[PDB]
Amino acid sequence: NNYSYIDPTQLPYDHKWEFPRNRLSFGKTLGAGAFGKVVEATAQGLIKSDAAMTVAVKMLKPSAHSTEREALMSELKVLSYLGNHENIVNLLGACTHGGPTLVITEYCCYGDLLNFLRRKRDEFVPKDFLTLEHLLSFSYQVAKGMAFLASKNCIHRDLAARNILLTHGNITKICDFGLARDIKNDSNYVDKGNARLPVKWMAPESIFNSVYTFESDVWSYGIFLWELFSLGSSPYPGMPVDSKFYKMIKEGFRMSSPEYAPAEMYDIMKTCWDADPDKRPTFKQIVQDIEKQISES
Ligand SMILES: CC(=O)N[C@@](C)(c1ccc(F)cc1)c1cnc(N2CCN(c3ncnn4cc(-c5cnn(C)c5)cc34)CC2)nc1
């Protein structure tokens, strides 16, 4: 074939990103798991020659298999291809010469939104009080970031309040692109792996058939909205993940409206959870909907 879709993970690493690893000073661990960790760090001279800035640095454990090493490089290449957006945790640099690959991203000083909502829950106002206006703004910003990803033919596959971070100026940023994929060629992705999965955030077709699409990211956005307007409650309260859970989801059980969700935001949630993926809204449509809500506020 003389025309093809360019696979961003096949492109060369662009050395414009390269930063000297001796100019990083690691601080505390921000997240940790089986394969590696993300740490806070000081980067000396990263943007301005004479200034230090705080960054986040993603790194694998020395024992990481080659499956994990290439996945980290692939994530670096996807972030390089996507480009910059206000509502994602942006790539700032990488250390790839010789030693372990380090991926340097923006640091979000307020941490993840799930923990933020839970801390602010008891003083929420339906001073520095969380308000409904904050929640509408966060819903809008995450929709904008996801619309951006979809516009680049990318899916995230783990959208959840725990993977939205908060930084200065009430700006929310989507983080953790380890499972993000460009799906330009086939319009879906079939997960063949065997890791633990975020079942309560997954579309039914992802649970039952391992298929991930633009539309399954939209399902997870609906679950995120329920977390958001519930001020950080866990989804499907009182329902463990077991045979009954899957049966109920398949038969059409859905969560009810959070107490603080405006009717038009619960309306979005319900459409995000349509059993038919074709009936779910796109992120582009969601952005326009929330825009209209904010302007009428
Ligand atoms: C399955 C798995 O192993 N995942 C691994 C463990 C993984 C790791 C390495 C690897 F190579 C492959 C996978 C994983 C992947 N991402 C992450 N994070 C996403 C990025 N993040 C942040 N970014 C930017 N700023 N920021 C600020 C805070 C913060 C916290 N408190 N306060 C006050 C601020 C947090 C972050 C937080 C965690 N944490 C672990």
Curated annotation (Swiss-Prot):
Phosphotyrosine: residues bearing it: 3, 5, 189, 266
Subunit info? Monomer in the absence of bound KITLG/SCF. Homodimer in the presence of bound KITLG/SCF, forming a heterotetramer with two KITLG/SCF molecules. Interacts (via phosphorylated tyrosine residues) with the adapter proteins GRB2 and GRB7 (via SH2 domain), and SH2B2/APS. Interacts (via C-terminus) with MPDZ (via the tenth PDZ domain). Interacts (via phosphorylated tyrosine residues) with PIK3R1 and PIK3 catalytic subunit. Interacts (via phosphorylated tyrosine) with CRK (isoform Crk-II), FYN, SHC1 and MATK/CHK (via SH2 domain). Interacts with LYN and FES/FPS.
What residues bear Phosphoserine in this entry?
A: 187, 257
Identify the residues that bind Mg(2+): 3, 163, 176
Residue numbers annotated as active site: 158
What modifications does the entry list under PTM / processing?
A: Ubiquitinated by SOCS6. KIT is rapidly ubiquitinated after autophosphorylation induced by KITLG/SCF binding, leading to internalization and degradation. Autophosphorylated on tyrosine residues. KITLG/SCF binding enhances autophosphorylation. Isoform 1 shows low levels of tyrosine phosphorylation in the absence of added KITLG/SCF (in vitro). Kinase activity is down-regulated by phosphorylation on serine residues by protein kinase C family members. Phosphorylation at Tyr-3 is required for interaction with PTPN11/SHP-2, CRK (isoform Crk-II) and members of the SRC tyrosine-protein kinase family. Phosphorylation at Tyr-5 is required for interaction with PTPN6/SHP-1.
> What does the annotation give as the result of altering residue 182 to V?
In MASTSYS, MASTC and mast cell leukemia; somatic mutation; constitutively activated; loss of interaction with MPDZ
Query: What residue stretches are annotated with the Protein kinase domain?
Result: 24-297
Query: What turns on expression?
Result: Up-regulated by cis-retinoic acid in neuroblastoma cell lines.
Q: Which residues lie on this side of the membrane: Cytoplasmic?
A: 1-297
- Segments of this protein annotated with the region Important for interaction with phosphotyrosine-binding proteins: 3-5
Q: What is the effect of changing residue 205 to K?
A: In MASTC; sporadic case; somatic mutation; dominant negative mutation; loss of autophosphorylation
Q: What does this protein do?
A: Tyrosine-protein kinase that acts as a cell-surface receptor for the cytokine KITLG/SCF and plays an essential role in the regulation of cell survival and proliferation, hematopoiesis, stem cell maintenance, gametogenesis, mast cell development, migration and function, and in melanogenesis. In response to KITLG/SCF binding, KIT can activate several signaling pathways. Phosphorylates PIK3R1, PLCG1, SH2B2/APS and CBL. Activates the AKT1 signaling pathway by phosphorylation of PIK3R1, the regulatory subunit of phosphatidylinositol 3-kinase.
Q: Give the family, as the similarity comment puts it.
A: Belongs to the protein kinase superfamily. Tyr protein kinase family. CSF-1/PDGF receptor subfamily.
Q: Which disease is it linked to?
A: Piebald trait: Autosomal dominant genetic developmental abnormality of pigmentation characterized by congenital patches of white skin and hair that lack melanocytes.
Q: What is the effect of changing residue 195 to P?
A: In a germ cell tumor of the testis; somatic mutation
What other comment is given for this protein?
Numerous proteins are phosphorylated in response to KIT signaling, but it is not evident to determine which are directly phosphorylated by KIT under in vivo conditions.
What is this protein identified as?
Mast/stem cell growth factor receptor Kit
Instruction: Indicate which residues the UniProt annotation says bind ATP.
Output: 31-38, 58, 106-112, 162
